[PDB]
Amino acid sequence: RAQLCQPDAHGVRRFNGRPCASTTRYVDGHKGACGCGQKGSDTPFPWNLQKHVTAPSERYFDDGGSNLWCGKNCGKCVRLTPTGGFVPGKGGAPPNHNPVVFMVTNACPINGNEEWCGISGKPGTNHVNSHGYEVHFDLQDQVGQVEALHWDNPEVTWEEVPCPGDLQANYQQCECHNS
Numbered sequence: 001r002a003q004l005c006q007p008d009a010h011g012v013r014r015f016n017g018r019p020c021a022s023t024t025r026y027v028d029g030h031k032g033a034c035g036c037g038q039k040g041s042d043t044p045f046p047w048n049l050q051k052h053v054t055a056p057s058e059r060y061f062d063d064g065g066s067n068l069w070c071g072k073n074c075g076k077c078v079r080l081t082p083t084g085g086f087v088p089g090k091g092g093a094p095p096n097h098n099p100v101v102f103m104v105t106n107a108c109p110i111n112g113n114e115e116w117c118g119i120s121g122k123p124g125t126n127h128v129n130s131h132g133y134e135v136h137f138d139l140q141d142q143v144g145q146v147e148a149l150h151w152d153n154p155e156v157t158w159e160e161v162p163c164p165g166d167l168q169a170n171y172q173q174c175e176c177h178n179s
């Protein structure tokens, strides 16, 4: 069993009573679904390609909704802590379990991402993806910021946390701030 989070009675994978999430990495160069780039143009701000930012699965992104622009959870931060687990054939165990904080700046839509982001309700409603996780975080890797962590799709526990000051200040430039 490479996945260390065990399903509960409802099928939701947990680790010592904390919910788990799956993770992947992505590179696409788009401004993204929280508007973190110049208005009207598909150009991200450089920090939104460089920093620890994420595209969560759609129903978390919009807190149960289906909006893919200025989702309800744009600008939230999440702390992801590796468990040591991974989905066999689709990841590996990381070299350490240091936790990393990421800011939500984009979305992973169900459409075209069914395996990982195809979750039909928000966290707390017992809906899971095809690997048993209630939420998925796709991690921006344009400049190798995830490669530098040596994260290959690790299984993590997840929690919402207050954003660090530099990420808060970055988010204030995004079009979806105060939308």
Ligand SMILES: OC[C@H]1O[C@@H](O[C@H]2[C@H](O)[C@@H](O)[C@H](O)O[C@@H]2CO)[C@H](O)[C@@H](O)[C@@H]1O
Residues within 6 Å of the ligand: 023, 024, 025, 026, 027, 089, 090, 091, 108, 112, 113, 114, 116, 117, 138, 153
């Ligand atoms: O659909 C989510 C996300 O997947 C990323 O690809 C995964 C792939 O699904 C998995 O089989 C392999 O082990 O890992 C890669 C990298 O995490 C893809 O890069 C993203 O564009 C996509 O949003």
Ligand SMILES: OC[C@H]1O[C@@H](O[C@H]2[C@H](O)[C@@H](O)[C@H](O)O[C@@H]2CO)[C@H](O)[C@@H](O)[C@@H]1O
Residues within 6 Å of the ligand: 028, 030, 031, 032, 033, 042, 055, 068, 069, 106, 107, 108, 109
């Ligand atoms: O890039 C601006 C554009 O973002 C759209 O969200 C995309 C995002 O670009 C892409 O990186 C991610 O994989 O998928 C999301 C959702 O499709 C957003 O929906 C548009 O409104 C926006 O103009």
